[PDB]
Design a protein around this ligand. Structure first.
Ligand SMILES: *[C@@H]1O[C@H](CO)[C@@H](O[C@@H]2O[C@H](CO)[C@@H](O[C@H]3O[C@H](CO)[C@@H](O)[C@H](O)[C@@H]3O)[C@H](O)[C@H]2NC(C)=O)[C@H](O)[C@H]1NC(C)=O
Ligand SMILES: *[C@@H]1O[C@H](CO)[C@@H](O[C@@H]2O[C@H](CO)[C@@H](O[C@H]3O[C@H](CO)[C@@H](O)[C@H](O)[C@@H]3O)[C@H](O)[C@H]2NC(C)=O)[C@H](O)[C@H]1NC(C)=O
Ligand SMILES: *[C@@H]1O[C@H](CO)[C@@H](O[C@@H]2O[C@H](CO)[C@@H](O)[C@H](O)[C@H]2NC(C)=O)[C@H](O)[C@H]1NC(C)=O
Ligand SMILES: *[C@@H]1O[C@H](CO)[C@@H](O)[C@H](O)[C@H]1NC(C)=O
Ligand SMILES: *[C@@H]1O[C@H](CO)[C@@H](O)[C@H](O)[C@H]1NC(C)=O
Lengths: 412, 408
């Protein structure tokens, strides 16, 4: 009698499932799966902000924070010491009050089971290790059981570029031809050892379809004030909506099953999207969603397609002292007379001197922090018009942000 | 009737410390814990600095000085600005609770440090036309002894610049003269927080001029030049650690302040030693250097360095995972290969919205590799570039540190 092992159902009894190292973290569904979605959502918003920071407000942005959280959780499996701790912290997995890092994989397995079990929402993970190497069995086993990531051998040593073409094809296969060149040229060479890959594919139909005979060409105004032609869709009906504080709007468009929805966030005609992006936290997002009431309204949005991509190594390691140097984001309310927070460090310098001779040595140094007050120029476009907005594709019962981004240019 | 409020004496309760905001982070153990944090910023920051420079250029800074100035700047920070500040400077690793308690510990440490000559002076220069918050002003005077001198930025930037620079020059015996560059201050400048640190000690074991000789020094780019090398033999704390690195400690009259020189073995690049550098590693080396009779020979030289902190700090978010040296992934390959690191990682995404619904896709690829090679052009035994640390031993504090890449 043979029975296929399944983590969703229960853990094996003999197959060892313990990572090589362990990090003990500080401090209406499953408490575990819930707290993990909360951590994931915390990485999504935090990462998004940093991402949006390094880009031009005229550029679109689109990513799957869940996808990223998944790939690195998979990579975490073999991490140790400091590498493991940083990973735990960077992805907010350590915000799960008291819990060893190895428990994260199982909660992650419980989440993926609930997510990928109306509207198509699939995911596939895979490991591509070099054929000449011998990979650790427990690692290979945990990866297959927790993330369903089997290890496929490739010849990086002798056939890098062909191996790359292989991994890219696999991913094109798991995303219906949508993601074709995930791994760039020269990214893989004879020194490569293992490539961990995650993919997520989603395609749903509106619970409340739009009718083609109602789409119209209209001018859409970008952040820099320039305009372009856009096809705007139109329909009126009952939709969950809400006009929050400062005038921000939140609109939820659900897909056939109702458990996956698209949430649109538009700032007040006078305020910029950047104001809404910096204020974005997982709690704020939750408050908005919470206080959403259904009502008769006219939904007016552009039909478009956007493709985006970026290096995580680059983005992840550039999260240092950012706010203090930003006129918009800097918060230094304590310095001046009465809360004046337009203060920000315009620049800081350091000078040092060292002399060593027969009698001894002399050393000097000075650090200068230069704070200045400034402002943000007014927004070019103030009149009501089609402007850029935020987009989220959520799984509601699981409180999970699958996709998210900024639709800054839905043209041509 | 009147007793000056002195923090070096006081206990947490006595000193009323209330900053605008607070941050909750996850028994002189504190002063100790603070020095560790500073030391951790020190190494982290150095590695990043060394990284963006040419291995042929010298490097010299005072991490303590930067930590101090930004700690002073932290007094008026809030929300995300305050958290980042707490984290980037590793203050969030101090087993405490509220972000305000570190200014109390930093004061305790500055007390022990500044009472060989080792002094420090901090001052705030605000625009005369503005009104500065009284509490902020009081706390900066109490904790860092930073008084607020008014200057006319709004009307006389260039003159005010000259003023601040002259004060710095005064507190560093004319060593640091142009800390603040031109155009760095203008009509919109509001406040300039300045820290200063000066040190001058004599060797506990002086060097004799009659023994200095010009010797060839080989730089990182291969070429060689002449340097005046000092010579003397005696008992010094030393040690030839793992991977063949040498650590030498030359103390100053008083023993409480010392210079530590770090030299990698011939076939190892200084750059690789810089990249592997961690507070713990540094500690272990220092921890048990044995005293022994040996011939110490080092160059006599001077180096002056300066740089903008914005660029550096803005990107201080590195993760060992992307570091060939520091990455730890012993669980992937059988037996435990240590050299595994993520060479790069990519994300790609797609979204299409139309009348019928929407379609989204995405992939994340993490590429792990091993066998990273650090260029090494001077692999023979000769005078080469080394690391320099000037530390306070009873307070395990790194006051100054740098790279001597060209004493010529
Ligand atoms: C200067 O910055 C100060 C921060 O260091 C800031 O102090 C805060 O001021 C408020 C109001 O004066 C205090 O709140 C008081 O009032 C509330 C309600 O009236 C009481 O419940 C409180 O107990 C308290 O009595 C804050 O406590 C105080 N924060 C501190 C110092 O702990 C000043 O407001 C700033 N002043 C200027 C000129 O802007
Ligand atoms: C593959 O990675 C494994 C981590 O998931 C790692 O597991 C460790 O394997 C060793 C065996 O060498 C276990 O040590 C055992 O042996 C002693 C004496 O026989 C026992 O007393 C111990 O309690 C233990 O059972 C480790 O405990 C085990 N680590 C854990 C926590 O699972 C393998 O070593 C790696 N294998 C290869 C090929 O590198
Ligand atoms: C930044 O943090 C401070 C607290 O450290 C927050 O201050 C509170 O602001 C609200 C207004 O929304 C007031 O009702 C409270 O009285 C404030 N608390 C204090 C200091 O008494 C502030 O809201 C935070 N700002 C952000 C980024 O949301
Ligand atoms: C890394 O952690 C392991 C246990 O997880 C420990 O045995 C080892 O000494 C650590 N490595 C270091 C930092 O020396
Ligand atoms: C620096 O300031 C002191 C007083 O604080 C003054 O006496 C001294 O002359 C100044 N330094 C010099 C010599 O310029």
């Amino acid at each position: 009698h043979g029975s296929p092992v399944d983590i969703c159902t229960a853990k094996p009894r003999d197959i060892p499932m313990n990572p090589m190292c362990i990090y003990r973290s500080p401090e209406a569904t499953n408490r575990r799966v819930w707290e993990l979605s909360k951590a994931n959502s915390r990485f999504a918003t935090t990462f998004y902000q940093h991402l949006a920071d390094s880009k031009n407000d005229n550029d679109n942005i689109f990513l799957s924070p869940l996808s990223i959280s998944t790939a690195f959780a998979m990579t975490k499996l073999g991490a140790c010491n400091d590498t493991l701790q940083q990973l735990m912290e960077v992805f907010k997995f350590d915000t799960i009050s008291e819990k060893t890092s190895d428990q994260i994989h199982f909660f992650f397995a419980k989440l993926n089971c609930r997510l990928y079990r109306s509207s198509k929402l699939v995911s596939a993970n895979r490991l591509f290790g070099d054929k000449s190497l011998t990979f650790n069995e427990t690692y290979q086993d945990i990866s297959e059981l927790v993330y369903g990531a089997k290890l496929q051998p490739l010849d990086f040593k002798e056939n890098a570029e062909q191996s790359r073409a292989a991994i890219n094809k696999w991913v094109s296969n798991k995303t219906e031809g949508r993601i074709t060149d995930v791994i760039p040229s020269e990214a893989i060479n004879e020194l490569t050892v293992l490539v961990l890959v995650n993919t997520i594919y989603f395609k749903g139909l509106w619970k409340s379809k739009f009718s083609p005979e109602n789409t119209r060409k209209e001018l859409f105004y970008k952040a820099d004030g320039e305009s372009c032609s856009a096809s705007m869709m139109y329909q009126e009906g009952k939709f969950r909506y809400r006009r929050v504080a400062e005038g921000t709007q939140v609109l939820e468009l659900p897909f056939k099953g109702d458990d996956i929805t698209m949430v649109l966030i538009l700032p007040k005609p006078e305020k910029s999207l950047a104001k809404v992006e910096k204020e974005l936290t997982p709690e704020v997002l939750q408050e908005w969603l919470d206080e959403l009431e259904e009502m008769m309204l006219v939904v007016h949005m552009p039909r478009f397609r956007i493709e985006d991509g970026f290096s995580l190594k680059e983005q992840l390691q550039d999260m240092g002292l950012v706010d203090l140097f930003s006129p918009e984001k800097s918060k230094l309310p304590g310095i001046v007379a009465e809360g004046r927070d337009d203060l920000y460090v315009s620049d800081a310098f350091h000078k040092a001197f060292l002399e060593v001779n027969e009698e001894g040595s002399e050393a000097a140094a000075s650090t200068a922090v230069v704070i200045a007050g400034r402002s943000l120029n007014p927004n070019r476009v103030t009149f009501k018009a089609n402007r850029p907005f935020l987009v989220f594709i959520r799984e509601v019962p699981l409180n999970t942000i699958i996709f998210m981004g900024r639709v800054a240019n839905p043209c041509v």
